[PDB]
Amino acid sequence: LSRLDKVEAEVQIDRLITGRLQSLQTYVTQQLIRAAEIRASANLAATKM
Amino acid sequence: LSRLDKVEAEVQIDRLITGRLQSLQTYVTQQLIRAAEIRASANLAATKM
Q: CA angle, A31 as apex, A18 and A39 as ends, to 5°?
C-alpha cells in the first residue's frame, strides 16, 4: 500500500488475503478437531471422577 | 454471463468458483467434525440404553 495504488494494489492484497484466509481456516479447522479430542478426553475425565 | 463473453467471463466465473468451492468445502469439513461429535453422542446414548 505504500508502493502501489488501488487498481494495482488490490491484485497483491488479494493474493495476501487468499493465503492468510487459507492459513486462518487451516488453523480453525485443526483447532476444531483438537477441541473434539479434548472433549472426548474431558468426557473420560468426568467419567473417571 | 449476460455481460461478458467466454474469455472475459471465465476469469470472473473462476473467481466465483474458487470462493463458492471454498465455502462448500468449509461447510463439508465442519459437518464432518459435527458428525464425529454426534456419533460420539450416539455411542454414549446407545451405551446408556
A: 160
Asked if residues B9 and A9 have their Cβ atoms less than 8 Å apart, the reply is no
Is the dihedral angle over the CA atoms B23, B25, B29, B31 positive or is it negative?
A: positive
Q: Terminal CA-to-CA distance of chain A, rounded, Å?
A: 56
Looking at this protein, which amino acid is placed at residue B26? Answer: T
- Measured between CA atoms, how close is A33 to chain B, in angstroms? 7
Residue bearing cell 440404553: B49
Resolution in A: 2.8
Among residues A20, A18, A16, the alpha carbon closest in space to that of B18 is found at A18
